[PDB]
Amino acid sequence: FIQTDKTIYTPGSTVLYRIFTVNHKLLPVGRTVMVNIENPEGIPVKQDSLSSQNQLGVLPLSWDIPELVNMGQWKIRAYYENSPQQVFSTEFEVKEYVLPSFEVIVE
Amino acid sequence: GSLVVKSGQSEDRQPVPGQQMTLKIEGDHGARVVLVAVDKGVFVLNKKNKLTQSKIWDVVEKADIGCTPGSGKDYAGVFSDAGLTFTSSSGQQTAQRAELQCPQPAA
Amino acid sequence: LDEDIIAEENIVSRSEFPESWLWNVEDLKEPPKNGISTKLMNIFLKD
Numbered sequence: 190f191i192q193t194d195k196t197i198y199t200p201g202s203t204v205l206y207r208i209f210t211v212n213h214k215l216l217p218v219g220r221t222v223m224v225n226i227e228n229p230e231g232i233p234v235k236q237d238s239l240s241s242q243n244q245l246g247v248l249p250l251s252w253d254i255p256e257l258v259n260m261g262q263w264k265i266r267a268y269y270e271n272s273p274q275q276v277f278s279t280e281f282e283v284k285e286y287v288l289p290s291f292e293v294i295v296e
Numbered sequence: 297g298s299l300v301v302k303s304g305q306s307e308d309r310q311p312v313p314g315q316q317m318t319l320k321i322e323g324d325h326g327a328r329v330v331l332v333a334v335d336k337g338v339f340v341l342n343k344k345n346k347l348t349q350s351k352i353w354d355v356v357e358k359a360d361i362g363c364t365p366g367s368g369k370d371y372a373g374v375f376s377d378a379g380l381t382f383t384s385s386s387g388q389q390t391a392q393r394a395e396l397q398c399p400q401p402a403a
Numbered sequence: 404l405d406e407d408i409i410a411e412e413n414i415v416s417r418s419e420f421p422e423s424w425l426w427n428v429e430d431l432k433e434p435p436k437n438g439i440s441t442k443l444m445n446i447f448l449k450d
């Protein structure tokens with residue numbers, strides 16, 4: 190399971206992400222994880238390999254977005270080392286924005 | 297478990313920007329907790345792909361090997377639809393299954 | 404100045420505006436009341 194600090198980011202900003210590594214019993218396991226970050230058309234731009242052993246199943250990591258970037262939907266994909274065919278994924282967006290000051294609900 | 301996050305203070309509603317406040321965290325003994333505090337205006341822009349506990353149990357239910365809410369065509373169909381194998385010394389045993397996924401309903 | 408307003412020099416501007424923060428890790432090792440550990444974290448707010 191992959192948690193990101195935001196669901197959408199700016200060019201030139203930092204993405205903070207924690208990967209929780211559990212077994213089938215949802216209990217923390219210590220294994221080596223292969224994580225990849227892919228572009229909108231599916232090009233891996235940054236990849237990692239790390240074991241969560243003795244870290245209580247938590248992999249806190251970081252990466253900086255360059256300003257030279259194609260805006261759109263970006264995907265993080267991850268899989269264990271001993272199970273490469275079981276691929277997990279979650280998505281986020283890159284755009285040029287400032288935050289609004291109010292919310293609109295359509296009911 | 298049961299992780300709850302609440303306010304330590306009981307008064308001074310809507311605190312001032314920069315003010316110190318007490319974050320109270322009740323939870324299971326021995327647990328490690330991770331935190332992130334986000335402006336809601338990020339979520340008004342994009343609230344997709346937010347992780348929650350209900351989606352975790354939804355992922356586990358999608359990984360279930362049982363395909364039917366009980367019963368079966370016979371004793372062998374009861375175990376096979378539940379997700380179990382049986383084999384006896386007399387000869388009675390479950391049906392062969394070579395597919396990981398569940399058979400699709402006609403719909 | 405003598406007028407009924409805050410002078411400009413001691414007006415202190417808000418400037419800490421990041422959207423996401425408090426990227427912290429803590430372990431529940433406080434005394435378990437009914438098995439529940441009560442952790443108190445006094446934290447600074449932002450601007």
Ligand SMILES: *[C@@H]1O[C@H](CO)[C@@H](O[C@@H]2O[C@H](CO)[C@@H](O)[C@H](O)[C@H]2NC(C)=O)[C@H](O)[C@H]1NC(C)=O
Nearest residue numbers: 228229230231232257258259260261262283284
């Ligand atoms: C330049 O970069 C853009 C992204 O900014 C890419 O073109 C995109 O391609 C996707 C399909 O994979 C479309 O959905 C987008 O609408 C395209 N963006 C556009 C047209 O601005 C591609 O890498 C390059 N495209 C061009 C036309 O130079």
